[PDB]
């Protein structure tokens, strides 16, 4: 497992598309989802300079083959899913085979249910800190890239997924440190609040416990 290079993170954070175009293809593959979100959707900035920057950022994402799946992930109507997650929350008061055997909205639904299950287990316990809260589809290595991408999409679309809560939930995933690193790499301004949320829980090393 590679991680996001530091220079890629400053390029994403400073939104400098000139040095963002000099990135390697795997680093660009890791950093796709936020670029697709800012390129496909309405810019919400509406300036000529950012229009030109969006034009230059549409070039390097065009050559990547894997961006079409992300574009399909944007096409799912998230408005129906927010009541679905709300109704699933009110009810609470192989996963890989289903992942590659179902469409994009059902993949969103199953990953979303996994994330809310981990969040509910986090909030229910005070200081349990399960090393493997749910050994699940995030643990296979073959499909973890699409898993992380779809988790990023299911994070930055709604307000139902808090950034610090997702950061605390991904700690109990057996491979969630890389997911958290690339998810922070996708949302660059949230690095400070993720760090603040992660420091604020747990006092000592607990003799290097889980």
């Amino acid at each position: 497992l590679q991680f996001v290079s530091p220079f890629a993170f400053e390029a994403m954070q400073k939104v400098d598309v000139v040095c963002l175009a000099s990135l390697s293809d795997p680093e660009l593959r890791l950093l796709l989802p936020c670029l697709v979100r800012m390129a496909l959707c309405a810019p919400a900035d509406q300036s000529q300079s950012w229009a030109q920057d969006k034009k230059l950022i549409l070039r390097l994402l065009s050559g990547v083959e894997a961006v079409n799946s992300i574009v399909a992930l944007l096409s799912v109507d998230f408005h129906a899913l927010e009541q679905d997650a709300s109704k699933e929350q009110q009810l609470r008061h192989g996963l890989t085979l289903e992942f590659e055997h179902s469409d994009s909205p059902r993949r969103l639904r199953l990953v979303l249910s996994e994330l809310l299950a981990i969040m509910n287990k986090v909030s229910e316990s005070n200081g349990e800190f399960f090393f493997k809260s749910s050994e699940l589809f995030e643990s296979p290595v073959y499909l973890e890239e699409a898993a992380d991408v779809l988790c990023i999409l299911q994070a930055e679309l709604p307000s139902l997924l808090p950034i610090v809560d997702v950061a605390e939930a991904l700690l109990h995933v057996r491979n969630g440190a890389w997911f958290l690193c690339l998810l922070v790499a996708n949302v660059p301004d949230s690095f400070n609040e993720v760090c603040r949320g992660l420091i604020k829980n747990g006092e000592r090393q607990d003799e290097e416990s889980l």
Binding site: E10, A42, P158, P188
Partner: protein, 253 residues
């Protein structure tokens, strides 16, 4: 050399102070004064690194603020080692910690400038602006907390000059200005932007630094009043004027 470097860091010539403090690290006897001089060297180096802000370049702004922050809390790492049971470095530690917090809040606000264009708005048919509304809410809360902490440093000093108290008041007014610039043109332009016309008559500013700070304050307040309701609250001009007000505030050493 120490007194000349002290005057250099008083008047904002921080590269000169950095060189003179490098020349002085081998001249002390106690390690306490060594840590104090090393901390002064790092503070001068960080304030020199802050001078690389040319204009309007938010990426270079992030780079310079990050380098200055690195040097500056390396300096506070070496400064709290110089704290003694007899005459502790309490005011220096609080002032440097507040400068660290102000620079970090500036960096977070520039990150939110960049997170306007990055991280586009959610699927929603204030509201319908995305996470950036809550981000400026948190930034306003942090800057108001910084203003209150500069105020309590002012209230806890009691032994400073008129000049040091004026400097602390200037830093408090700086973060208050940033909080008001967030509020008056991102959160609620309708409720805010009253008749806040400062009666700038006899500008009896004792120092050149004070003159620069009030000139920056007047310019930023005039820009905020001129861009009050001219745009929607999710605006590129709002982020640009606020995010260049950051640069104007940090340009003066």
């Amino acid at each position: 050399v120490y007194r000349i470097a002290r005057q250099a860091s008083r008047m904002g010539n921080h590269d000169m102070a950095k060189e003179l403090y490098q020349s002085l690290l081998t001249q002390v006897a106690s390690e306490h004064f060594y840590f104090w001089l090393n901390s002064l060297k790092e503070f001068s180096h960080a304030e020199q690194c802050l001078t690389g802000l040319q204009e309007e370049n938010y990426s270079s702004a992030l780079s310079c603020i990050a380098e200055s922050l690195k040097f500056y809390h390396k300096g506070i790492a070496s400064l709290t080692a110089a704290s003694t049971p007899l005459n502790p470095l309490s005011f220096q530690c609080e002032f440097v910690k507040l400068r660290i917090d102000l620079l970090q809040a500036f960096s977070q606000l520039i990150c939110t400038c960049n997170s306007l264009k990055t991280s586009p708005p959610p699927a929603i048919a204030l509201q319908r602006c995305g996470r950036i509304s809550n981000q400026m809410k948190q930034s306003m809360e942090e800057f108001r907390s910084l203003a209150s902490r500069y105020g309590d440093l002012y209230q806890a000093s009691f032994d400073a000059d008129s000049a040091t108290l004026r400097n602390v008041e200037l830093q408090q007014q700086s973060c208050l200005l940033i909080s008001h610039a967030i509020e008056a043109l991102i959160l609620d332009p309708e409720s805010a932007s009253f008749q806040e016309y400062g009666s700038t008559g006899t500008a009896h500013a004792d120092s050149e630094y004070e003159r620069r700070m009030m000139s920056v304050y007047n310019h930023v307040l005039e820009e905020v009043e001129s861009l009050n309701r001219k745009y929607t609250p999710v605006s590129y001009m709002h982020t640009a004027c606020l995010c260049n007000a950051i640069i104007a505030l940090l340009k003066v050493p």
